Amino acid sequence: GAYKYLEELQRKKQSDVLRFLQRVRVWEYRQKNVIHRAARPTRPDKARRLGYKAKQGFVIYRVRVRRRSLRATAEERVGRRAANLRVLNSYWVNQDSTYKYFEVILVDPQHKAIRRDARYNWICDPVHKHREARGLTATGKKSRGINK
Amino acid sequence: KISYKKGAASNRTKFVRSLVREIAGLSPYERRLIDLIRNSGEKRARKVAKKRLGSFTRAKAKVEEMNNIIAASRRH
Amino acid sequence: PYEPLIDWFTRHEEVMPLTAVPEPKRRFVPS
Amino acid sequence: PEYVRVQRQKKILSIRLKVPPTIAQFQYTLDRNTAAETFKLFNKYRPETAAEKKERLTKEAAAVAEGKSKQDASPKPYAVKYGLNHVVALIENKKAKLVLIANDVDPIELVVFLPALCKKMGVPYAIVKGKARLGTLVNQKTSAVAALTEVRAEDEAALAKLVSTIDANFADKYDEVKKHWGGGILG
Amino acid sequence: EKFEELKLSQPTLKAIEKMGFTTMTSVQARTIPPLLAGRDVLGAAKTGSGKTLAFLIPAIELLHSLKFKPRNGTGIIVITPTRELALQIFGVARELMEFHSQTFGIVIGGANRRQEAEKLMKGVNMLIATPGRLLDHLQNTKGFVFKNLKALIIDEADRILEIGFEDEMRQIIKILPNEDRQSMLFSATQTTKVEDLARISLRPGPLFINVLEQGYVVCDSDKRFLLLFSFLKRNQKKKIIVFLSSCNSVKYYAELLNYIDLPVLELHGKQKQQKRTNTFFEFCNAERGILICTDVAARGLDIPAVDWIIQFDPPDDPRDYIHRVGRTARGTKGKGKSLMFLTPNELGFLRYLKASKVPLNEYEFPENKIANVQSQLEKLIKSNYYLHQTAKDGYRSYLQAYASHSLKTVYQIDKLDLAKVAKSYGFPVPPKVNITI
Amino acid sequence: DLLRPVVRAPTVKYNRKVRAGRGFTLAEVKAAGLTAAYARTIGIAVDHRRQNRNQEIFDANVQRLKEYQSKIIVFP
RNA sequence: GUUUGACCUCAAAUCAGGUAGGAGUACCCGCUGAAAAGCGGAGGAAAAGAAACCAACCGGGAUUGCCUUAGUAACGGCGAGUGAAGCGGCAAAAGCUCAAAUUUGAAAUCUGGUACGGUGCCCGAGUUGUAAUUUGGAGAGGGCAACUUGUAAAGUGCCUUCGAAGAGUCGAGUUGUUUUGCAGCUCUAAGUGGGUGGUAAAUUCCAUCUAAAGCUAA
């Protein structure tokens, strides 16, 4: 599958091609708001290994944050904005000297596709509501420093 | 028990990384390091590489990789 | 500055594929 | 509007700044007639729609219905193939006697490797222009890739000659200008 | 005497019966009671006289006597130079051990490292291996049960010395335990370094028993199989034997030709030895048949006076081929014409032929008279899964046999164009094989 | 309660001491002639990250599994 | 062809269906924080949770809580005094799911509407990948052998070939904070790699896991 090639092309970020894509996409997002929706993940490999599935009930938001942690705060922004959505996880996509750009994956527990497909029904439970608020996300656990 | 991650580098992997580094090009510090090699020798090349990096083993790795680039480019 | 990119490794052509996956049964029998 | 302004501002800065030579391999694409005959070739190898699939399925299920049913063996289907990871999968075998790569993909990094991959593998790849038209010939909105492996004898000569043609028009013409930095002129 | 009177386990008796051997060869008769006595020994025997069975029976007797579990130890080690002989020995031993309770495996240069690594992790009670890969196994594999060494064998020491692996067995035997190990070895001839290795190996004092024009067809690498097919069609109704390298190639070509409906007999190691004897019997009695067999499987038995010797695949020991053709010429009063296929990279072999000083004849190939079946071969391979897999296995074993070849100056895998070999087997594109290139 | 391995203790203060463990191994349950997955449905604990390194502990827990198999009657 | 149509993107809905707030807050989880207060978020519990673990043994084996370890180790104008953890006994015990190679001999996936949770038909979503199978304890492909539970699904013995994994991350410099960790700025790797920890009769050895993703009752 092609997603490997995405992974190892992403591995070389400061290379000419990906720095060019960084520098065009940073500007293009700069024209856009602080928070807004993306039609598709710009790093689909990262989204999958963080748990993305391309079907109804998976929402992509691009969040802009000024330079707690920046990733956690960015997650909290969409947490307040999209209360109905539940924050799954986020990842880094782009940055600027003025702002850092992150892509967050949110899941709707109301769409029957998520409510069915018992692989993901677990997020429908009320106990998972606002994981980012309680630091239960990946960055939340990392900042809390919970490991063995 | 030794994890299969431990075993070795598959042919697909060396192929993939060679193809990536080809299509990526050379970074401005790398574009520097090639000229610094060609001009003032591997000693100063290693010094500058280690200053750019943190440790020395990564420095020798980088210098050896870039000598591979220089050799496989100029002669072929 | 800028310089053109060298094609020193693309010019070598491999005569074989990367992976020797054994062909599965289902590709030859009706599904 | 904001987004009309953005999209009109998009494609200006990209040409304003120097695109990497791995890009601008795109938009140095197949000429008019050659794309036209490529699509005429493909339109014989449209994949079966979900609707046609279901019609043949109910037909054959009804054929099994009879007492006095009928049992037969049928040959392989023939169609283009279009899914991205599947397209790369038919590469590294190799099986793609042809691959078409759309130029306009918003995550271009999904496709930047495909030209070099098929170059080194020797698959006769071509950069088609417009993912939507690939979608039209494949019962999809968009495809971004179109690989073909198996071809009937009635088109095999056409396939081979088109392969030589694309080798003449794309690999020969644009390899030296695939080989330079594009863009960089202000707008 | 016979094999069956000697004290043997019932499963070994059944295996011997189903492989059909009742009598023994005289030298094997001399060596067997020594093998039961447990003394070390060196021996001179002709290649393929049944000496493989001669050690397989008493080693399995030892495993009857000890009854140790697969995890407890590995026991018997077998060292054989070439991949072909190792595979033939494995195929001979597979049934003998299938009636018996212990475990078998292969350790060969060119096979997947991970398969054999996992097998060594599980443990193998009868190891059969080539000299080169055993060092890697003993130095790299962890937890491999090695301390036992109930016994060990070397086969045809002259050939390993010719290959140049003497350092490797010195290193191994330094790694090997000795007090539990008992060494038997077989080598038709001997040299001083072979005797040195024997002195290091044989723990007690051993008692030993000691008892022309050629065609060359320079055919380019792809049309050689099809040229064989055409030449075979033209010389139908003449009994002909073809020498290959890999048993897989023999098998695949056999049913390939059977599908094209020309009668063929197959004689390769993987077959059961009774089907082997039967096939040789119908070949000898019919007097008009195509036979496809490996170099060493042919070596192990005498050849009836034949219309054509062809060697399709490269030889294993070219010196033995020169002597074999000499003996065939002086033995078969009926003229047996011998020819070898070649590849344009192989012309060095011809100068080696000039070193043999025997005369040589060029047999020309007309580009007009071509079967033109390659498209049909491609369509068949695309159609049938079974022929697909068998062609792939034969091709894979062909390249692995090239990897195991000794004389590199005459055969370099780099010289060979692999797309074109793949076309020879009927693949447009080479299937990948893990081979060091 | 689920049946458990009798296991050897670590350290030197209790090097002489024997304990109740978590699970046997895959290798040991295979030596029992049954599978770990099916052995779960019977109420036998299984631990995969553990390794068997002592012969006597292994043999004792094997005989323990034999007597467990003997005393159990399973309903279809 | 100045036409028409494929997409992409964006708007607008008194279009259809849902969802967020607020109160309380004894317990729980994050942020902030003085000489606790405050903020944010639930639930009946919550959190954590199946080793990039602990150890050096004759090794142990998710997490959680109690006794002990123990007022010991360690820390501290080594002053005030601060203050653990392995292991062991006990309670209760639970293991699982992704992401990496193709189904390509047929997206096999699913929301919604409609006629009778299900079934049909139709819109759609989706190949920039929904299904099945595989999470390293391996697993996959076939073939042979038997078994055991509509050319149905699953388990085991043997031969051969294959056998794919978390990067602005690891790490390094510096600044602030904290008692080693955390946060910011410059830099940024490798794959028989990497991390951690012992070890010399030292051009050393072997020891132990696999991060940069996720769920899980008691």
Nucleotide of closest approach to A12 (CA, C1'): G167
- Smallest CA–CA distance from D179 into chain B, residue: B23
Beta bridge pairs of residue E44? E210
Nucleotide of closest approach to F27 (CA, C1'): G137
Instruction: Give Cα separations from E79 to E152, E193, E318 (angstroms).
Output: 8, 17, 21
Residues of B in contact with C10 (CB under 8 A): 22
- Smallest CA–CA distance from D90 into chain A, residue: A1
Tell me which residue of E27, E88, E116, E101 sits closest to E60, measured CA to CA: E101
Pick D1-187's CATH classification: 3.40.50.1820, 1.10.3470.10, 3.30.390.50, 3.30.1330.30.
3.30.1330.30
Beta bridge pairs of residue D100? D126, D146
Structural domain for B41, as ranges: 1-76
Helix axes E418-425, E223-234, angle to 10 degrees: 30
Chain-chain contact of A31 with D113 (C-beta, under 8 angstroms):
no
Select from C7, C13, C18 the residue whose CB has the most chain B CBs within 10 Å, as the one to mutate to test that interface: C18
Instruction: Give Cα separations from E41 to E30, E74, E152, E190 (angstroms).
Output: 12, 21, 11, 14
- Smallest CA–CA distance from D92 into chain B, residue: B12
Which member of B11, B25, B76 has the closest CB to residue C8?
Answer: B76
Q: What is the CATH number of the domain that holds A109?
A: 3.40.1120.10
Which member of C5, C14, C30 has the closest CB to residue D120?
Answer: C14
Do B and D make contact via 3 or more CB pairs under 8 A? The reply is yes
Task: Quickly count helices (H) and strands (E) in chain B.
Answer: 3, 0
The C-alpha angle with vertex E348 and arms to E343 and E352, in degrees rounded to 5, equals 120
Is E49 annotated as belonging to a binding site? yes
- The number of residues making up chain C comes to 31
CB E56 within 8 A of CB E15: no
Structural domain for A128, as ranges: 2-144
Structural domain for F11, as ranges: 1-76
Is E45 annotated as belonging to a binding site? yes
Domain range summary for chain D, segments of one domain joined by +? 1-187
Give resolution, Å, one decimal: 4.0
Helix axes E83-98, E10-19, angle to 10 degrees: 120
Residues of A in contact with D108 (CB under 8 A): 21
- Smallest CA–CA distance from C17 into chain E, residue: E432
Bridge-based pairing state of the strands D182-183 and D18-19: antiparallel
Q: What is the CATH number of the domain that holds B6?
A: 1.10.10.1760
> F72, exposed or middle or buried, with CB in 10 Å at 0-12, 13-18, 19+?
exposed
Select from E397, E432, E437 the residue whose CB has the most chain C CBs within 10 Å, as the one to mutate to test that interface: E432
Give CA–CA dist E237/E233, Å, rounded. 9
Chains in contact with chain F (at least 3 beta-carbon pairs closer than 8 A): none
Nucleotide of closest approach to D105 (CA, C1'): G128
CB A22 within 8 A of CB A101: no
Give CA–CA dist A75/A89, Å, rounded. 8
Residues of D in contact with A3 (CB under 8 A): 85
Helix axes B57-74, B28-52, angle to 10 degrees: 150
Residues of B in contact with D112 (CB under 8 A): 23
Do D and A make contact via 3 or more CB pairs under 8 A? The reply is yes
Tell me which residue of E21, E22, E43, E13 sits closest to E31, measured CA to CA: E43
- Smallest CA–CA distance from D181 into chain B, residue: B25
Give CA–CA dist E104/E106, Å, rounded. 7
Q: Is D158 on the interface with B (CB under 8 A)?
A: no
Instruction: Give the distance, in angstroms, between the CA of residue B6 and the centroid of all CA atoms in the same chain.
Output: 22
- Strand (E) or helix (H) holding D141: none
Is E48 annotated as belonging to a binding site? yes
The C-alpha angle with vertex E57 and arms to E55 and E59, in degrees rounded to 5, equals 65
Which member of C5, C10, C13 has the closest CB to residue D21?
Answer: C5
Chain-chain contact of E114 with B2 (C-beta, under 8 angstroms):
no
Is E73 annotated as belonging to a binding site? no
Tell me which residue of E193, E107, E190, E185 sits closest to E153, measured CA to CA: E185
Residues of A in contact with D19 (CB under 8 A): 20
Give CA–CA dist E255/E260, Å, rounded. 9
Task: Establish whether the linkage from the previous residue to A12 is cis, with ω within 30° of 0.
Answer: no
- The number of residues making up chain F comes to 76
Nucleotide of closest approach to D81 (CA, C1'): G104
Report the gap between the CA of D22 and the closest CA in chain B (Å).
7
Chain-chain contact of E433 with C22 (C-beta, under 8 angstroms):
no
- The number of residues making up chain A comes to 148
Residues of A in contact with B32 (CB under 8 A): none
Q: Is B2 on the interface with E (CB under 8 A)?
A: yes
The SS3 of residue E240 is strand
Own/partner long-range contacts of E24-32 (Cβ < 8 Å, ≥24 apart): E24/E50, E25/E49, E25/E50, E26/E211, E27/E209, E27/E211, E28/E53, E28/E54, E29/E1, E30/E209, E31/E209, E32/E6, E32/E57, E32/E58
Own/partner long-range contacts of E323-327 (Cβ < 8 Å, ≥24 apart): E324/E299, E325/E212, E325/E214, E325/E358, E326/E212, E326/E358
Give CA–CA dist E429/E419, Å, rounded. 6
Put simply, the chain E residues between 401 and 430 with a CB less than 8 A from any chain C CB are 417-419, 429-430
CB E82 within 8 A of CB E316: yes
Rg of chain B (C-alpha set): 15
- Smallest CA–CA distance from A13 into chain D, residue: D109
Report the gap between the CA of E115 and the closest CA in chain B (Å).
13
Query: Which two tokens mark A117?
Result: 């497909």
Put simply, the chain B residues between 10 and 39 with a CB less than 8 A from any chain C CB are 11-12, 15, 18-19, 22, 25
Query: Which two tokens mark F5?
Result: 């391995």
How many domains are contained in chain B?
Answer: 1
Chain-chain contact of B19 with D116 (C-beta, under 8 angstroms):
yes
Give CA–CA dist E228/E312, Å, rounded. 8
Report the gap between the CA of C20 and the closest CA in chain B (Å).
11
Nucleotide of closest approach to E90 (CA, C1'): G159
Residues of C in contact with D119 (CB under 8 A): 10
Residues of C in contact with B22 (CB under 8 A): 7-10
Is E189 annotated as belonging to a binding site? no
Own/partner long-range contacts of F30-37 (Cβ < 8 Å, ≥24 apart): F31/F62, F32/F62, F32/F65, F32/F66, F32/F69, F34/F69
Beta bridge pairs of residue A106? A59, A87
CA–C1' span, A131 to G86, in Å? 34
How many domains are contained in chain F?
Answer: 1
> E267, exposed or middle or buried, with CB in 10 Å at 0-12, 13-18, 19+?
buried
Nucleotide of closest approach to D133 (CA, C1'): G6
Residue with tokens 């000569």: D157
Which member of B2, B7, B11 has the closest CB to residue E142?
Answer: B2
Report the gap between the CA of D181 and the closest CA in chain C (Å).
7
Instruction: Give the distance, in angstroms, between the CA of residue E387 and the centroid of all CA atoms in the same chain.
Output: 23
Instruction: Give Cα separations from B58 to A124, B21, B26, B52 (angstroms).
Output: 47, 17, 17, 10
Chain-chain contact of A28 with D6 (C-beta, under 8 angstroms):
yes
Nucleotide of closest approach to F22 (CA, C1'): G61
CA–C1' span, A70 to G42, in Å? 23
Put simply, the chain B residues between 9 and 48 with a CB less than 8 A from any chain A CB are 16-17, 20-21, 23-25, 27
Q: Is B3 on the interface with C (CB under 8 A)?
A: no
Instruction: Give the distance, in angstroms, between the CA of residue E152 and the centroid of all CA atoms in the same chain.
Output: 20
* C–E CB contacts, 8 A cutoff, strictly below: 33
Residues of D in contact with B23 (CB under 8 A): 22, 112-113, 116
Give CA–CA dist D60/D69, Å, rounded. 10
